[PDB]
Design an enzyme around this catalytic site. Structure first.
Site, PDB file in Angstrom:
ATOM      1  N   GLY A 108     -35.518 -36.050 -15.374  1.00  0.00           N
ATOM      2  CA  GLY A 108     -34.216 -35.553 -14.948  1.00  0.00           C
ATOM      3  C   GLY A 108     -34.297 -34.502 -13.852  1.00  0.00           C
ATOM      4  N   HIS A 154     -34.061 -43.772  -6.083  1.00  0.00           N
ATOM      5  CA  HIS A 154     -34.426 -44.390  -7.362  1.00  0.00           C
ATOM      6  C   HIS A 154     -33.359 -44.164  -8.467  1.00  0.00           C
ATOM      7  CE1 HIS A 154     -36.498 -40.543  -8.558  1.00  0.00           C
ATOM      8  NE2 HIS A 154     -36.027 -40.880  -9.756  1.00  0.00           N
ATOM      9  N   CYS A 186     -35.489 -35.029 -10.989  1.00  0.00           N
ATOM     10  CA  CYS A 186     -35.434 -35.758  -9.727  1.00  0.00           C
ATOM     11  C   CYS A 186     -34.220 -35.318  -8.958  1.00  0.00           C
ATOM     12  CB  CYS A 186     -35.443 -37.266  -9.970  1.00  0.00           C
ATOM     13  SG  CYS A 186     -36.835 -37.848 -10.981  1.00  0.00           S
TER      14      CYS A 186
HETATM   15  C1  LIG Z   1     -40.528 -39.549 -18.177  1.00  0.00           C
HETATM   16  O1  LIG Z   1     -41.119 -38.249 -18.171  1.00  0.00           O
HETATM   17  C2  LIG Z   1     -41.143 -37.551 -16.992  1.00  0.00           C
HETATM   18  C3  LIG Z   1     -41.717 -36.288 -17.076  1.00  0.00           C
HETATM   19  C4  LIG Z   1     -41.786 -35.489 -15.973  1.00  0.00           C
HETATM   20  C5  LIG Z   1     -41.264 -35.921 -14.732  1.00  0.00           C
HETATM   21  C6  LIG Z   1     -41.352 -35.158 -13.545  1.00  0.00           C
HETATM   22  N1  LIG Z   1     -40.950 -35.587 -12.353  1.00  0.00           N
HETATM   23  C7  LIG Z   1     -40.420 -36.814 -12.285  1.00  0.00           C
HETATM   24  C8  LIG Z   1     -40.241 -37.672 -13.367  1.00  0.00           C
HETATM   25  N2  LIG Z   1     -39.945 -39.042 -13.274  1.00  0.00           N
HETATM   26  C9  LIG Z   1     -40.255 -39.915 -12.304  1.00  0.00           C
HETATM   27  O2  LIG Z   1     -41.166 -39.731 -11.504  1.00  0.00           O
HETATM   28  C10 LIG Z   1     -39.496 -41.226 -12.362  1.00  0.00           C
HETATM   29  C11 LIG Z   1     -39.998 -42.162 -11.288  1.00  0.00           C
HETATM   30  C12 LIG Z   1     -40.966 -43.118 -11.570  1.00  0.00           C
HETATM   31  C13 LIG Z   1     -41.559 -43.849 -10.552  1.00  0.00           C
HETATM   32  C14 LIG Z   1     -41.184 -43.639  -9.233  1.00  0.00           C
HETATM   33  C15 LIG Z   1     -40.199 -42.708  -8.965  1.00  0.00           C
HETATM   34 CL1  LIG Z   1     -39.724 -42.418  -7.317  1.00  0.00          CL
HETATM   35  C16 LIG Z   1     -39.597 -41.981  -9.969  1.00  0.00           C
HETATM   36  C17 LIG Z   1     -40.675 -37.212 -14.647  1.00  0.00           C
HETATM   37  C18 LIG Z   1     -40.633 -38.017 -15.808  1.00  0.00           C
END
Ligand SMILES: COc1ccc2cncc(NC(=O)Cc3cccc(Cl)c3)c2c1
Ligand SMILES: COc1ccc2cncc(NC(=O)Cc3cccc(Cl)c3)c2c1
Lengths: 304, 304
Positions: free
Chosen positions: A143, A41, A145
């Site tokens: 961030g 992603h 990720c």
């Molecule tokens: C935007 O705020 C955050 C906060 C904590 C967060 C903690 N872990 C991950 C984040 N972002 C995502 O998951 C981005 C995303 C969205 C949809 C699908 C996929 Cl594979 C990835 C985080 C974002």
């Protein structure tokens, strides 16, 4: 004595943490040998995050579009591939700090250490468990990720998790190092059912053994139980059913304490039916399930 | 989102972990530059551990008696000195992996990461706090002596703790890196009064802010309180008295949530007078005091 939620030393893993930038997006990568692994992603933008065509999005990308940075020095990307939900960027330099490593897919109920990173820089390390519903209850921000979960045996780092996503419920979903998500989760900004999560019974029993080993015995009683009777109680309280394999894995802790696994099951049955009555076990007012029998053995024996 | 008991990445600290052997005893040492720091009780034997004459015991010792091992390579000891309760062994080689470091004496209520080691090999890392009574609630076994506690700001490791001793009560006592014990403790196998321990109020309040930031708000209420009224409640429940300095340090979390520190004090007052009523805050059935306001800010902002 003492019982902490101890994580593995993150040293061998910090040496692999890189920053991956693709377009406007930045996340973490794992540089092992001449390959950098990161969540696919990274090739996405906000507009296409609802349902991205990853194959089509990756096609508009060339090796020079992916920017891999190791601390300060830039890595030269010579190949790019998509394996399930991870991108494997072949870099021209092999990571001098690559440890002996394995890519392993952990089972639910297993534990691992997570090195949370932002922009390729590590910020912290915490021990956590792969929940029975394949989610993790970590601490991740935007961030994070690309942050990986791992275990360490002697000198070998077994990478088991790569963080991809935070579910609307605040829990975290990610993949193994081959790009396969644990659970039904997909890398789309879509509402996803996390599933019913249960309590890892064998881990709670292992932590009860760790409590006896460390002086906490108030919960021990004059009662015993059968596997069948205990499993009825476990079903009522949303605990994973105990099998003879679980009892077998509790053999070492049962021999160290001299408390039969079915006598410890009877103590857990009472703790579930009656609560803690305001008391604590190992400094906690609830039953803990994020310590496997191996974790308790390692911590109470001192394996380095 | 998510809130874990996160420790600093231990990488910079693993590079300093050495094994120190003196006579029949082995413990851990901290190799920084051309000096190896370790607990002075390495020069002791079981017989003299009740009340050792450290000056006299060290006199019967020469540089060649202390065996310092860094992974596998032996270090050459050219000087030995005793500074309070630590020995400083001058080695002929400066540690190539020495990070930017400071020796700091932490205040009670402050937190730090501990890298538990055995025979110079790290086994795990956990975040913990210097209790108001100067003890630490760590996880240490025989051979863990010499394991250090530290904090990390950018690239600088501030070493704050060296483990020396486990009290009969199972709690741990140790020194700063200049050999000064935190608390009244002495390096003798004698029964020692740990002292009355209180709850670090400002840390519990910081963790309540971390709970609001991460979705847990059930504990919030239509009430407020004064510093004086709250302090009477804190005294009854063995909580550290709250000062205007504590309120000032909670300024950043108060501004992020928009919840006045005295309104959060009123929520804590209710939680103390009424308990959790079977509920949890950040996955815990008790009030947590091992997260300083800085820890909550770092974890909820993502400082690397
Ligand atoms: C935007 O705020 C955050 C906060 C904590 C967060 C903690 N872990 C991950 C984040 N972002 C995502 O998951 C981005 C995303 C969205 C949809 C699908 C996929 Cl594979 C990835 C985080 C974002
Ligand atoms: C022998 O079993 C253990 C178990 C856990 C332990 C955890 N931390 C430390 C240990 N040993 C000592 O404290 C040795 C000692 C004795 C008196 C005074 C001093 Cl400065 C040092 C431990 C030993």
């Amino acid at each position: 004595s003492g019982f902490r939620k101890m994580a593995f030393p993150s040293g061998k893993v910090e040496g692999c943490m890189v920053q991956v930038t693709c377009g406007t997006t930045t996340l973490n990568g794992l540089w092992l040998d001449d390959v950098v692994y990161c969540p696919r992603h990274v090739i996405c933008t906000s507009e296409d995050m609802l349902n991205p065509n990853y194959e089509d999005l990756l096609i508009r990308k060339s090796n020079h579009n992916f920017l891999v940075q190791a601390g300060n020095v830039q890595l030269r990307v010579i190949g790019h591939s998509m394996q399930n939900c991870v991108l494997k960027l072949k870099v021209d330099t092999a990571n001098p700090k690559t440890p002996k490593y394995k890519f392993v897919r952990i089972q639910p109920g297993q534990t691992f250490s997570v090195l949370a990173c932002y922009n390729g820089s590590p910020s912290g390390v915490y021990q956590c468990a792969m929940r029975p519903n394949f989610t993790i209850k970590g601490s991740f921000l935007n961030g994070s990720c690309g942050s990986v979960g791992f275990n360490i045996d002697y000198d070998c780092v077994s990478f088991c998790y790569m963080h991809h996503m935070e579910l609307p419920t605040g829990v975290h979903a990610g993949t193994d190092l081959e790009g396969n998500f644990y659970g039904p989760f997909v890398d789309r900004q879509t509402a996803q059912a996390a599933g019913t999560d249960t309590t890892i019974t064998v881990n709670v029993l292992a932590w009860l053994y760790a409590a006896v080993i460390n002086g906490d015995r108030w919960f021990l009683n004059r009662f015993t139980t059968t596997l069948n009777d205990f499993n009825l109680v476990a079903m009522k309280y949303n605990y994973e059913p105990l099998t003879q394999d679980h009892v077998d894995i509790l053999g070492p802790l049962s021999a160290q304490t001299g408390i039969a696994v079915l006598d410890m099951c009877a103590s857990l049955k009472e703790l579930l039916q009656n609560g803690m009555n305001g008391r604590t076990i190992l400094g906690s007012a609830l039953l803990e399930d994020e310590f496997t029998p191996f974790d308790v053995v390692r911590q109470c024996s001192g394996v380095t």
